[PDB]
């Protein structure tokens, strides 16, 4: 509350290591259906269907450009690339096993990071 804080988290190498985790992120194997934006005109149903598309390349640029407020802001754009990819894609296909493989390696790299 006013005057009462506490102890203040070092924060200070919050950007870096986001940096650091996105880049293992973008070289794994199976990062190749979160690259780039999904195609809004040749992907019938993804306009409509996907409030808020996400994908790395749109991450890295926001990061780089102070467009995340802080590591929780973040965590939520990465998280939301995998929540898009389980709403649109089948479990059994090769980009819905590439999204869960993809979510338990960030939350390993996350968790070893910051907790």
């Not at 980009?95 to 493989?101: E, P, S």
């Amino acid at each position: 509350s006013m005057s009462v804080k506490k102890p203040k988290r070092d924060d200070s190498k919050d950007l870096a290591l986001c940096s650091m985790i996105l880049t293992e992120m973008e070289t794994h194997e199976d990062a190749w259906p979160f690259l780039l934006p999904v195609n809004l005109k040749l992907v019938p149903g993804y306009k409509k269907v996907i409030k808020k598309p996400m994908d790395f390349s749109t991450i890295r640029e926001k990061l780089s450009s102070g467009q995340y407020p802080n590591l929780e802001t973040f965590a939520l754009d990465v998280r939301l690339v995998f929540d898009n990819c389980e709403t649109f894609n089948e479990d059994d296909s090769d980009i819905g096993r590439a999204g869960h493989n993809m979510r338990k390696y960030f939350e390993k790299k996350w968790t070893d990071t910051f907790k």
